[PDB]
């Protein structure tokens, strides 16, 4: 096992259950992202029929054609993808055109999930709810709020962001 993963675990073990629950929300979002990338990865592998790790115009053309994209569209896609005009398209270049960039921050999305009522503040009750399936109690929650504010018993996105960043 790589030392960086080992060191990550050792740092993780020192934080509170609530901090790490919050980390798990973000971890779910990485899993989702990574699933999309995996599909693109499998797509790339199928297009690369000579298995040379890059895509020619023809390799992409013949597949887009067989799936209903018309010549005029395929050619515009090809010239957008081939950003270096090399006649060979890299994994990174292919994936840039395949990935849905809409809604691309991890911390903001986690905060929004926690703020159940979308009022822009994380209340005590928002944390009670977050831990509804965990054996944690009111002592743990109070500690978390003190930690956040040691850097109104409510938390703005900025105070949320500032706390989480200080734990990395």
């Amino acid at each position: 096992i790589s030392p960086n993963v080992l060191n990550n675990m050792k740092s993780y073990m020192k934080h509170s259950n609530i901090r790490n629950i919050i980390i798990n929300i973000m971890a779910h979002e990485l899993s989702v992202i990574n699933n999309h990338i995996k599909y693109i990865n499998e797509l790339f592998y199928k297009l690369d029929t000579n298995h040379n790790g890059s895509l020619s115009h023809r390799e992409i053309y013949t597949v887009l054609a067989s799936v209903g994209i018309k010549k005029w569209d395929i050619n515009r896609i090809l010239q957008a993808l081939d950003i270096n005009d090399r006649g060979n398209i890299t994994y990174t270049e292919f994936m840039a055109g395949c990935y849905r960039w809409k809604n691309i921050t991890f911390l903001k999305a986690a905060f929004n999930k926690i703020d159940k009522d979308e009022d822009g503040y994380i209340s005590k009750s928002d944390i009670v709810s977050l831990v509804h399936d965990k054996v944690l109690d009111n002592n743990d929650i109070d500690n978390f709020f003190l930690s956040v504010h040691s850097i109104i018993n409510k938390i703005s996105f900025q105070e949320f962001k500032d706390y989480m960043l200080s734990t990395f």
Copy 2:
């Protein structure tokens, strides 16, 4: 091919070469992230010796022990990872403790790469430099600056962010 990937390509083809060059910077950052996740994925697969898609305490214990982590550390890692105290640790929970969260936004990182001199503004010369390995010229660059400001011939992070978001 899934229709969402096809639609992503069709939207990508409509944007400028410079917009898409900027997208490629972010795409590289997704590749990096995805490589880390792939390692964690392969690690998870090796630990899961009964291939039931989750990790018992023992499965993790026996491996951390064989690599130099001491009992007292392994146990703290186990109780941090087992966030639901289930005796079974999920892929998401494992990955939360293995991933380096330090420096976790895509647009900010792209902007910083483009702002060569770290002055907080994207100048005309920063874009000239960005396209140094592309056949693009001064006409293309001017178009890009007009587009950004149609929503000082310089670009702040906010104006950069606002333009990119409007193209998603």
